[PDB]
Amino acid sequence: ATAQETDRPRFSFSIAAREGKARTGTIEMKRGVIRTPAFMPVGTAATVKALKPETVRATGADIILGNTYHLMLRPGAERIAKLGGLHSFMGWDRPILTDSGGYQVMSLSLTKQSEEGVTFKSHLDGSRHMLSPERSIEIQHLLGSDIVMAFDESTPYPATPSRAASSMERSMRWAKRSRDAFDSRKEQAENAALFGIQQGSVFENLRQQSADALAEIGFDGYAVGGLAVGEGQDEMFRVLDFSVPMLPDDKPHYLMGVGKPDDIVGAVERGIDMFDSVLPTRSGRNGQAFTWDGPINIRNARFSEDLKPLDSECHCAVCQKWSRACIHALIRAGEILGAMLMTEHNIAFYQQLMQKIRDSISEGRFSQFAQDFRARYFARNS
């Protein structure tokens, strides 16, 4: 029997190779295989400005992220389910990870907050919505996503040691509630996976408390929450240094909302397996391209006659055809094609970064790759 004819497991994480704290391997799921370390582009509605799903796939993405908060405001979770689920809605038939909605409640919406959950006003039309461990898992079930995030409590940066601890403890009680809600639905529990989220801010003892609590409940994967919220890379790396080793070794480790290319490399050096970020898309819409020599602003006059591709080594479809000069022309003209090409290149560049990370770990030369990568990225000889 071929691989195509073979039964696919619900969730199987295998580690193929290690170098220090870094790992490379695969997550097998029913909708496909995810190569790790993995970068997940953030999915959106299919507007004139969004890439086609076949384009996103061709950049190398194995899985994309859906924002539960935005999908529950428009067109709503029940509507997405009636349309066949999020995979049908987005035209993406591979795995999808959904966040819980809890972060955007804090950052974008808030009527009531308690141990029960939260009620909040749409930032769009003032309507009231409710989220809780139970409602968040139910909505992610309606979306049909493959990896479900537990609902937790975010504490804004920077947080009092007092605020850090009470928020982490509530998040751990909410993590058990998320577990039980997920397990209550046979359709979800047999076909999807559930990740828990470690909290504790910068405090090693709180982080250990959270890790032990999550490990006692048991999850398919573990995210490190509370980072990439304003703390700077130095602090972020310091927290990762002691937080990641606390999580179960044989499950994936997910750093949510990270990030810049150098953030990703250093986080993999510290044991992270999964990443998401809007940065390649946001940068692409704003005329900024990622390259191995650092970011470039394509509107700069120096690019108007530059016949080289955006990046000298990138093998994305954009760089195999389009010059800096012509992408500069399109962006300066306000032509949507310009932003589309930048965005495709940026997402593909992120995937090629992940592939170089995976390859170098497999070959036992990742520590040297990370050194070579930083020297060149920060030299900015673009």
User: Closest separation between CB of residue 339 and a copy of itself, Å?
Assistant: 14
Q: Which tokens is 370 given? A: 């990370």
Is 150 a residue that touches Zn ion (CB under 5 A)? no
Query: Which does residue 314 touch among a copy of itself, Zn ion, none (CB within 5 to 8 A, set by kind)?
Result: Zn ion
To a copy of itself, the closest distance from the beta carbon of 278 in angstroms equals 27
Answer for the pair 150, 197: CB distance below 8 angstroms, yes or no. yes
The annotation status of 311 as a binding-site residue, yes or no, is: no
Q: Contact 169/203 with Cβ under 8 angstroms? A: no
Task: Give the nearer residue to a copy of itself in terms of CB position, either 115 or 335.
Answer: 335
Asked whether position 316 contacts Zn ion by CB under 5 A, the answer is yes
Give min distance, CB of 333 to a copy of itself, in A.
7
CA distance 223 to 244: 9
Cβ nearer to a copy of itself, comparing 33 with 329: 329
**Alpha carbon of 123 to those of 70, 72, 137, 139, 188: distances in Å?**
10, 12, 22, 19, 30
For 345, the enclosing helix (H) or strand (E) is: helix 336-362
Half-sphere exposure of 134 (CA within 13 A, CB side): 4
Given Zn ion, a copy of itself, none, residue 217, with its beta carbon under 5 to 8 Å by kind, binds: none
Tell me the closest approach of the beta carbon of residue 318 to Zn ion, in angstroms: 5
Q: Would you say 343 and 331 are in contact if contact means Cβ atoms under 8 Å apart?
A: no
Consult the annotation and say whether 319 binds a ligand: yes
Asked if 193 interacts with Zn ion (CB under 5 A), we say no
Q: Are strands 64-66 and 32-36 parallel, antiparallel or unpaired?
A: unpaired
Burial of 156 (C-beta count, 10 Å sphere; 0-12/13-18/19+): exposed
Nearer to Zn ion, 178 or 283 (CB): 283
| DSSP calls for 46-100 | --TTSPPHHHHHHTT-S-EEE-HHHHHHTT-HHHHHHTT-HHHHHT--S-EEE--
14: DSSP letter: E
* Least distance between a copy of itself and beta carbon 165 (Å): 57
Chosen from Zn ion, a copy of itself, none, partner binding at 345 (C-beta under 5 to 8 Å by type): Zn ion
Residue 319 engages Zn ion in binding (rule: CB under 5 A): yes
Contact 153, 132 (CB under 8 A): no
Catalytic residue among 62, 146, 220, 276: 276
* 51 contributes a contact to Zn ion by CB under 5 A: no
Q: For binding to a copy of itself (CB under 8 A), which residues are involved?
A: 305, 307, 321-323, 325-326, 329-330, 333, 335, 337
Is 276 a residue of the active site?
yes
Q: Is 199 annotated as a binding residue?
A: yes
Identify which of residues 126 and 334 has a Cβ nearer to a copy of itself in the complex. 334
Binding positions for Zn ion, 339-368, rule CB under 5 A: 345
* Beta carbons within 8 Å of 95's beta carbon, 6+ residues apart: 29, 31, 32, 34, 62, 63, 146, 147
Annotated binding site: 99-103, 152, 199, 226, 314, 316, 319, 345
By the criterion CB under 5 A, which residues form the site for Zn ion? 314, 316, 318-319, 345
Active site positions, annotated: 99, 276
